[PDB]
Structure 1
């Protein structure tokens, strides 16, 4: 019953994911191959969040989610890391459509009842990372 943000297809048995599943007991290489086979369609290099569901018989199923908004905002602005001092140092610029584009994909993981509400969550996400909206 663990939640991870492993890479798009770079699901190594490496320490980023390796020891996490070990305490439960699921086969490490089994999950790594299963995750990659369905995330090949995902754009390259994305920390797609997956929630693992392990059982008592040492079996597991997992569900993948849309990429995090902060990741989507980082690629939308063409940057790699956020502002060190958000709302003090400004490190990018994205249009409202770029907010709509990110909101639409994350709408599968949002909770707002409208595109405007979903956007405002993304707008709040943008301010918290120093990315101003332009």
Structure 2
């Protein structure tokens, strides 16, 4: 990749690649093939895990078929199934409501090693500070 051309990312799902009300048609309809994300995706699905958030880019020009790419999960979301609470407030952030796991934030961030600029993997942590002071939820460090 030394040249971007077309990319729309709308976090899909693994266990069955065959939506319809969420995405379905709207994921493939301008030279894209609905028949091949269940031939090709699931070929890169089961090696890892299934069910949870999947942003994604594909290689469709106007060339009929294509080839599918993978990505990475959102980072403040690894503070849901990778922290506690699943909203983020409840008392609008006029109140500092949330609550953290200091141990986590490094290895749970580190899981997103393949998409960050910090050389120091510790730096990749310091990013997650603000990503996790996104409400004003203090970490019991």
Q: TM-score range by the shorter chain?
A: 0.7 to 0.9
Shift of 1:130: 5.1
TM-score by length of 2: 0.75
Shift of 1:121: 1.8
CA distance in 2, matches of 1:74, 1:56: 39
CA distance in 1, matches of 2:31, 2:115: 29
RMSD over aligned CA atoms reads: 2.5
- SS state of the match for residue 96, structure 1? coil
Shift of 1:62: 2.2
Q: In structure 1, what is the equivalent of residue 28 of structure 2?
A: 22
Shift of 1:57: 1.1
Higher strand share: 1
CA distance in 2, matches of 1:101, 1:66: 15
Question: Hey, which bits of structure 1, 4+ residues long, moved more than 6 A?
Answer: none
Range moving further from structure 2, 46-55 or 20-29: 20-29
Range moving further from structure 2, 103-112 or 53-62: 53-62
Higher helix share: 1
Change beyond 3 A, Cα 1:112–1:27: same
Question: Which structure 1 segments of 5+ residues have no match?
Answer: none
Shift of 1:47: 0.5
Q: In structure 1, what is the equivalent of residue 127 of structure 2?
A: 121
TM-score by length of 1: 0.78
Shift of 1:132: 3.5
Change beyond 3 A, Cα 1:29–1:59: closer
Change beyond 3 A, Cα 1:87–1:129: same
